[PDB]
Amino acid sequence: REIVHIQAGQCGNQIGAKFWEVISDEHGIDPTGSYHGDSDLQLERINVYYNEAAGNKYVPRAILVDLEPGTMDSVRSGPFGQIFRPDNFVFGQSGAGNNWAKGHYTEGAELVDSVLDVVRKESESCDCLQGFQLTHSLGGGTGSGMGTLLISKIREEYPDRIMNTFSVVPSPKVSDTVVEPYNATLSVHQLVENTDETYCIDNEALYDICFRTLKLTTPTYGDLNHLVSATMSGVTTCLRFPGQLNADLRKLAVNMVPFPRLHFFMPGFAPLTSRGSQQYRALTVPELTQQMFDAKNMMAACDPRHGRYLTVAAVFRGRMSMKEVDEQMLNVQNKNSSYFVEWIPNNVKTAVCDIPPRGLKMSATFIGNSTAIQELFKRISEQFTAMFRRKAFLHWYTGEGMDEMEFTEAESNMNDLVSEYQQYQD
Amino acid sequence: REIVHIQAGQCGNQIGAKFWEVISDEHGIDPTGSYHGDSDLQLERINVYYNEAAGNKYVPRAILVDLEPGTMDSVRSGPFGQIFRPDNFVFGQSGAGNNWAKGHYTEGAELVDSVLDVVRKESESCDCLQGFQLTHSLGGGTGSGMGTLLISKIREEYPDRIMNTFSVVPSPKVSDTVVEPYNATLSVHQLVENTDETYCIDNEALYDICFRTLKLTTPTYGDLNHLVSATMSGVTTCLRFPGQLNADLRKLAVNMVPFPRLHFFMPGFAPLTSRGSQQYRALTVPELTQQMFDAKNMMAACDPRHGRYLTVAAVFRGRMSMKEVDEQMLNVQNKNSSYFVEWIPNNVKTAVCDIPPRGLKMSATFIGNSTAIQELFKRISEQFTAMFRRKAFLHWYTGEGMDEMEFTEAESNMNDLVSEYQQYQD
Amino acid sequence: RECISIHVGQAGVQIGNACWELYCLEHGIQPDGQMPDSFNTFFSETGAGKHVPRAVFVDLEPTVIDEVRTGTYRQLFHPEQLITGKEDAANNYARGHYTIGKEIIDLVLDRIRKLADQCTGLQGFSVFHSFGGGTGSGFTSLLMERLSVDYGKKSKLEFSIYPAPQVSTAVVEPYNSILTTHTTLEHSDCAFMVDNEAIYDICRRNLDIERPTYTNLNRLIGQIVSSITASLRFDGALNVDLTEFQTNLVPYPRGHFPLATYAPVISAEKAYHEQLSVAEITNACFEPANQMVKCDPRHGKYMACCLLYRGDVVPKDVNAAIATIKTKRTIQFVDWCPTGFKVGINYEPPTVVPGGDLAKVQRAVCMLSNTTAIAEAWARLDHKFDLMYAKRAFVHWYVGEGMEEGEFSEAREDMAALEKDYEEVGVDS
Amino acid sequence: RECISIHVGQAGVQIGNACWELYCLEHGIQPDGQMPDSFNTFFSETGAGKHVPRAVFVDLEPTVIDEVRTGTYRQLFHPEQLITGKEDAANNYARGHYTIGKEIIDLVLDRIRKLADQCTGLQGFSVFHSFGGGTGSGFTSLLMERLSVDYGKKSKLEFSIYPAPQVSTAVVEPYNSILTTHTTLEHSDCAFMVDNEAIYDICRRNLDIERPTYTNLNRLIGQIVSSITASLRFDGALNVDLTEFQTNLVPYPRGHFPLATYAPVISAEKAYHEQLSVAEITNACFEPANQMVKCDPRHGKYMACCLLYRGDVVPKDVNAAIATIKTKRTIQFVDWCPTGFKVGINYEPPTVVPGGDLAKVQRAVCMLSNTTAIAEAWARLDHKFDLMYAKRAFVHWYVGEGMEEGEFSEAREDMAALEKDYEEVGVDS
Amino acid sequence: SRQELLAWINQVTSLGLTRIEDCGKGYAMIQIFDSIYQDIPLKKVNFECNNEYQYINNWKVLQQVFLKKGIDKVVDPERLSRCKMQDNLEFVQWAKRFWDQYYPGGDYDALARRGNR
Numbered sequence A, B: 001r002e003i004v005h006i007q008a009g010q011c012g013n014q015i016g017a018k019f020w021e022v023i024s025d026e027h028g029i030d031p032t033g034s035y036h037g038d039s040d041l042q043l044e045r046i047n048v049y050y051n052e053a054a055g056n057k058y059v060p061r062a063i064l065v066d067l068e069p070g071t072m073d074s075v076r077s078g079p080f081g082q083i084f085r086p087d088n089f090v091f092g093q094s095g096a097g098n099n100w101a102k103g104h105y106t107e108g109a110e111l112v113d114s115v116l117d118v119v120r121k122e123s124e125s126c127d128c129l130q131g132f133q134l135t136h137s138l139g140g141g142t143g144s145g146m147g148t149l150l151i152s153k154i155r156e157e158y159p160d161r162i163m164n165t166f167s168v169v170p171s172p173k174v175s176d177t178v179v180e181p182y183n184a185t186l187s188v189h190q191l192v193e194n195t196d197e198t199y200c201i202d203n204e205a206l207y208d209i210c211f212r213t214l215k216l217t218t219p220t221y222g223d224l225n226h227l228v229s230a231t232m233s234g235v236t237t238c239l240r241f242p243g244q245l246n247a248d249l250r251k252l253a254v255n256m257v258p259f260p261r262l263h264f265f266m267p268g269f270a271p272l273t274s275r276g277s278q279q280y281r282a283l284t285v286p287e288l289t290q291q292m293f294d295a296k297n298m299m300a301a302c303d304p305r306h307g308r309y310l311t312v313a314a315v316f317r318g319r320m321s322m323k324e325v326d327e328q329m330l331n332v333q334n335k336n337s338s339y340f341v342e343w344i345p346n347n348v349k350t351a352v353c354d355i356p357p358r359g360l361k362m363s364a365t366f367i368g369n370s371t372a373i374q375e376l377f378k379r380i381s382e383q384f385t386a387m388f389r390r391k392a393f394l395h396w397y398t399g400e401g402m403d404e405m406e407f408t409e410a411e412s413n414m415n416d417l418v419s420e421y422q423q424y425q426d
Numbered sequence C, D: 001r002e003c004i005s006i007h008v009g010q011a012g013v014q015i016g017n018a019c020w021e022l023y024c025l026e027h028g029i030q031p032d033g034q035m036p037d038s039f040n041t042f043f044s045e046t047g048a049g050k051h052v053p054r055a056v057f058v059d060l061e062p063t064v065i066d067e068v069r070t071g072t073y074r075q076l077f078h079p080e081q082l083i084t085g086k087e088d089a090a091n092n093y094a095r096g097h098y099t100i101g102k103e104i105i106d107l108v109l110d111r112i113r114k115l116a117d118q119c120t121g122l123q124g125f126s127v128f129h130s131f132g133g134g135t136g137s138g139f140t141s142l143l144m145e146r147l148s149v150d151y152g153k154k155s156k157l158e159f160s161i162y163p164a165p166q167v168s169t170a171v172v173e174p175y176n177s178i179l180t181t182h183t184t185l186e187h188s189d190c191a192f193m194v195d196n197e198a199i200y201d202i203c204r205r206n207l208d209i210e211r212p213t214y215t216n217l218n219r220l221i222g223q224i225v226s227s228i229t230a231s232l233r234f235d236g237a238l239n240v241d242l243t244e245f246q247t248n249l250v251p252y253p254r255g256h257f258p259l260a261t262y263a264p265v266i267s268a269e270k271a272y273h274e275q276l277s278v279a280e281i282t283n284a285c286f287e288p289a290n291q292m293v294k295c296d297p298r299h300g301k302y303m304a305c306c307l308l309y310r311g312d313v314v315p316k317d318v319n320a321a322i323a324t325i326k327t328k329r330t331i332q333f334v335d336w337c338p339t340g341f342k343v344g345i346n347y348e349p350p351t352v353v354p355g356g357d358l359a360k361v362q363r364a365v366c367m368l369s370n371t372t373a374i375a376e377a378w379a380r381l382d383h384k385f386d387l388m389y390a391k392r393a394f395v396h397w398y399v400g401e402g403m404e405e406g407e408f409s410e411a412r413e414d415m416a417a418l419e420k421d422y423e424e425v426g427v428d429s
Numbered sequence E: 001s002r003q004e005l006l007a008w009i010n011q012v013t014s015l016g017l018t019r020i021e022d023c024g025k026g027y028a029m030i031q032i033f034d035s036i037y038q039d040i041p042l043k044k045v046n047f048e049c050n051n052e053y054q055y056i057n058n059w060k061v062l063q064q065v066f067l068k069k070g071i072d073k074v075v076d077p078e079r080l081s082r083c084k085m086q087d088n089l090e091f092v093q094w095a096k097r098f099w100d101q102y103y104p105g106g107d108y109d110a111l112a113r114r115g116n117r
């Protein structure tokens, strides 16, 4: 087995709606309805994300944490919004100020206990717990601060179960906030030291990948979210399906993290073709690896081509030859020996489910642990200093009971984190 | 296997529409339809020009390169225009200025990478690549400049696969442009040093051959194009058919090029009789060689009778006697011992397919490598100097980032090219 | 006699379902258990109508054993004999051997002690595992482990599917296979080996098909295996007991690993072509492109081969076809070994799946052997290990699972003397 | 035993399909393989109800071998025995021999080692190639090359279709034929030669038809060849083994090239006319307008002829018809040769295509021989070469294909001593 | 032409530049201005610049110099930062003209100004 999703902040929340929008259909669960599942296999493993109460009501086992009512009151007042048991909504009608400090030390710190409470009600649900899924943005209060706390507590309560983190690291070109590097640097800090699998997505790496890899001209947020949620479904849920060679969070973790930092990955989906036309079906397989392993198509901002890889996990999910899979992976590992690090004879971790994404014939989620993501924490870390130096909007933090040594801490930490990652690029 | 056509410029493009108009019917491929093929043989070898995606959609594997939208937007908005996958259209909405320099150094140089990209997507299609077909005119920007670049890059990427070039060398009598010799001399230069098989066609050698060898009174462009496309079908595609004695691009290349320049040929079709009346059927065979080997009927401007031959390739395609074929060729070689060069005991390269041009009983493409084409590059080269001397419309080149030594280069090169060719006429 | 069998790991279970299929198929026992001693050394005549299997199934994810209890054959085994640990598989030795795998073992054993009792003077347990897995490497490691002590007085022939030479799957594979080798080494009697990749070649080169589903490789081993137990434990003109193997097959205590090979692999659709001669198939056995193992006799001197024949075969034909071989020299046998050819002759010809892709001849040769060749295969698999260990790679995944720098480093040294062993017992005179 | 056959090059394959046709046609084996030892020296009884061929097919473009697996006969060969290299043919020796052709050879050999094993004490490989081609000249060059070493202990009779004297096709032809001669020379046993053009004459002058499709010339050689192997390896009143040939046919190690000739070439539609006498056909054999070779006995003294007769023939008729010849003098035989007339008598008369254009007599004479005549044919073909080499003509096409100024110049010198050889062994006493 | 300009630029700046596209980084443009004005914050300019974000800083610096001086000439960073050949070719051509007219007699040490970067 199981897992318990966590919708920290608005973003992490907004996405919840999309991650569950999807996943459900990938499990035949209508709003409050039950399992309409076109098949019978989309049920033997659901437990991983739901709970048995009525007999038609398998309720998503996630948490909705946020200090801004309106948000959860938009997610709960729309489509699938009426499937979460109200108990799940851990709101904080307070002022959800955009301060990491306001949602981690002053405002969020209160709402925490009333959260952990539930995160335990859900964990002690039944069977055996695997880990928790965490969605949020490292550029706000309820996201980076309060969600980054939720984990620091989770990881003290079950240092056994895993912790995948889906972070929306502050996009480069244009940030959707001003203190961004403040709320960010501070949350990455907490991440590098609690969760043990992080999948960093960039609102603009998506646009690109969504406006040129999907001739999509008006990529609304819903979309971006939708694309992301597509990857997190391939990861988890997927592997909780049969397969010639299946893995599960741990395999993924125990094959992808060479060194305890926790390291962050960069997810990539397979068939990413525009609707009508493009429906080329060039998906024999070399076409999927063609996809997944290119620069563009990496939900991350940075480009792999800018730094070796430590590990890779092509989590495919659609009937294919353990030969044309196991094989391709190789040439790929040799055509690009340059960037793929050497002290790991077989960086790649081939994974293979069976049933594919409901309406598709063949897909393959990509979870890359490349050293390229160095060039992102750099970014973030830079923005900090350039503004920390002048203590820019620092009074909104300190004035909330913070420390001048707290910011120092994080930057350094996360800043060192950049350092290390280079220790392998070389 | 295979080959990948290339529609450089408008002309090369306009012709694409005719080369594909034909070829398709010579392969039963309707607009977007599939193989309606009257037979079953027009399919076992198609691959050479298409790709398998749907199961009724074999899409032409060519490239459409042009800096003038309107053009490709006329080819894509008409008849067979809706068969090319949009990915094929590598447009350059820029100002497709009529400058060789504007489509080879400044404007085209940008659009190039976005072309090579595809020329690789198509090359790495499947099976084994043979070479690429290239259509264009040496009297404009997108044609001589940008297309002449496309190859210089192609020939660096696969100096193994062949490169047939179909050039519309600047017709004598009247030039359909003004700088013509500028855009030309500059492109021939690039040709003599990259592609290894060039078939030079002359809009006025066609008219003639189309207004007197086809009582055709209103020879629209479509026609000329159509006639040309008729020859390039006999060449390639054809030989990718069975035959008592079949050849293929290489044979054609390895039997026609005595010396590495690349040398240019002059294609000639066989049954070229006016519709109704003329339908004399005098096509036993002596009638085809009668045809092919006469002066008029050589798509080139120059007349063979004005210079020996080095090689000849009668690529026939219609059931005939390897005796009445192999034989005729001989007398022909003796009645004209005068012009046929001697240091090659058997200049002629008899080739023999089986299935003929869809609706015809017997045809035979002619690919002549005569020294006569000396008297054309001369022409071109002359026009240059007469105007270079005064730097006529040179500011449109230099002002586009060119060199006064660039023009010098080409002329000389291509000018020397004239020289050499005489080294055999003697 | 009999010989129990423990199919461990999803794979060992898929292969199991396969080998288990071929069985009834050539014994007239529909999936319903009913047919309308001999073969009792693999089937117990439970109740008065059926023939409950004579083995067990161990996987830590339900998925794979589940599928068995869906598809006809569902009726074949006892609801009991298919052990599962709803928990987690984990493609890591440690977890499967120590931590998790432990919890189940007792229960597992119980069956191989409950099924081992019910019988009449057995001979051993044909174990089916997939070297480089979690439930397959680890678990078994201690299963075979707990057997060597509870029944040291029997045969422990483990039929493995060791790591594809270049086409491995798991990222860690070697960690899991250098560990299943060292822990099982001091516990097995004879370890048969069938290379997953080197079997594909056979499917490409000797049967033609770029569409080989796992379900095929399984049909294949599912064949070579049928030649081992099934038919052999079955009367014939030259019977060969299980003990026989290890005796005539292992020169030294190292649970030595011979290689499995089959002779007639030819695709249906070829099915009509004039059959192959006793001489041809015999000869096909000395071709490094037909041996279910990427251990091409690159130098490895054979040191003992057990030519199991089945179908219409004249002992002279053999005691001649083999003679011709003994004098081909380019087939160089070890020095210290005069004659190393155990000729096993059975009667009943093979039995091909009704409509898979196996030819269906009236005679075959499932020759297995110990070849100084694996000196390679082990080497190439050991080296792998180091590279990663050299950086600890996925080490934290085992440590955190009740293992130590010991078990790795000390299991590496282990195989080291397996690279020297397979070197000394040969290459020298 | 027998005598395998390797049809190399599109042509050698077209001719192959032809010679292969005539075969079953006179052995009652429909295209389905089934007929309702003797001839076993060319057909293996795969079981079974069929008669799988006893040869192989090698072309680097699929086109031509493809057509075989379309048109009835499609059923005749084994899907396997028809080798192809999807790649490129190239009308150039070099590429076919070295560069490309190389890649396939192994595989090629494999069959002529896999097909050479299956049999019972064979005699050799009847090779079918077209001198002046890419796959035909080059490739074989090394095929026969690799044979002379792997089976030096057999017969290597290569049946060639050397360059039309004036009606060649390829522009380079000589390059490809001066190269297939020098490389094969030191490897063949007896090289039969059938001139493509000089066969047309026969189709114009001795059958009347200006419509001769390649499919005809093939029916012809397809005939003369049937007289070689087919019927000869077939019982008779004066059997002649393959070895027999080379022995009674080559005076010297140079893989000497005799010429093929047939006697009764008369067109159907003539089919009713009173048949020709044993004396006439015999005499027709000494006419330079009926010999499938533009090597008119312009002076070339015969030095050994193997008169293979078939049908109703009285040995005295022969041992008289030949006597009359031995004393025509204008037919001057070499000096150092008293008697050079190997009389081969078969029983079964010829067997003409149901409705092609071949008369269909009840007796024929397929006489082949070594004639000091080719002193010409080689000469005229050598000269060709020089002219071009003298200017390097299409040389860059080979060099760039793993050859050198060596192989050409050093293969020219080669034949040079073939112009002196065929000169010395004759013209002098 | 590109060849001529590149030769000129490399000699002036003591740069390696193989192609015009390299100018897209914006460093060279800033230094050219520095040779004329000598006001540019050279330490700030990312001479070596690998990444686009760095290019933007160079552009900003360039823009500021234009503004400070009151230089009317347009600078379309979006086009140039792409490192497309045509845009850069055009800009470089203008810059050379600017340099020719503006550059004073005083000697300029490109290496020193860069700090030998």
Ligand SMILES: Nc1nc2c(ncn2[C@@H]2O[C@H](COP(=O)(O)OP(=O)(O)OP(=O)(O)O)[C@@H](O)[C@H]2O)c(=O)[nH]1
Pocket (backbone or CB within 6 Å): A244, A245, A246, C008, C009, C010, C011, C012, C014, C015, C060, C089, C090, C091, C092, C096, C130, C132, C133, C134, C135, C136, C137, C161, C163, C164, C168, C169, C170, C196, C214, C215, C217, C218
């Ligand atoms: N021949 C054959 N090989 C198989 C089959 N299934 C898996 N394998 C191979 O065995 C190895 C896979 O082991 P896994 O399926 O990952 O694991 P497991 O051994 O079942 O146990 P866990 O790791 O705990 O799931 C790979 O080397 C596969 O190539 C099968 O059905 N037949």
Ligand SMILES: Nc1nc2c(ncn2[C@@H]2O[C@H](COP(=O)(O)OP(=O)(O)OP(=O)(O)O)[C@@H](O)[C@H]2O)c(=O)[nH]1
Pocket (backbone or CB within 6 Å): B244, B245, B246, D008, D009, D010, D011, D012, D014, D015, D060, D089, D090, D091, D092, D096, D130, D132, D133, D134, D135, D136, D137, D161, D163, D164, D168, D169, D170, D196, D214, D215, D217, D218
């Ligand atoms: N008698 C006869 N001669 C043939 C036949 N086909 C081709 N030839 C002759 O053989 C030569 C042709 O060789 P090609 O077909 O060009 O080449 P190839 O030897 O098959 O091999 P490649 O050059 O690689 O294609 C010419 O001299 C032809 O006249 C045939 O069916 N019968």
Ligand SMILES: Nc1nc2c(ncn2[C@@H]2O[C@H](COP(=O)(O)OP(=O)(O)OP(O)(O)=S)[C@@H](O)[C@H]2O)c(=O)[nH]1
Pocket (backbone or CB within 6 Å): A008, A009, A010, A011, A012, A014, A015, A068, A096, A097, A098, A099, A137, A138, A139, A140, A141, A142, A143, A144, A168, A169, A170, A171, A175, A176, A177, A203, A221, A224, A225
């Ligand atoms: N992909 C994606 N990114 C989002 C979404 N909502 C917000 N973001 C991104 O997340 C960051 C801010 O997230 P936001 O949702 O405002 O956090 P919050 O904590 O809920 O904000 P607050 O309540 O303190 S103001 C910005 O970088 C923005 O671009 C969403 O639905 N999808």
Ligand SMILES: Nc1nc2c(ncn2[C@@H]2O[C@H](COP(=O)(O)OP(=O)(O)OP(O)(O)=S)[C@@H](O)[C@H]2O)c(=O)[nH]1
Pocket (backbone or CB within 6 Å): B008, B009, B010, B011, B012, B014, B015, B068, B096, B097, B098, B099, B137, B138, B139, B140, B141, B142, B143, B144, B168, B169, B170, B171, B175, B176, B177, B203, B221, B224, B225
């Ligand atoms: N045969 C033939 N010749 C053509 C065709 N279109 C143009 N030409 C010839 O080609 C030359 C100019 O070709 P054009 O198509 O204008 O090149 P372009 O590069 O596309 O032109 P631009 O975009 O720089 S102005 C002239 O000599 C003209 O006679 C055509 O469709 N068929």
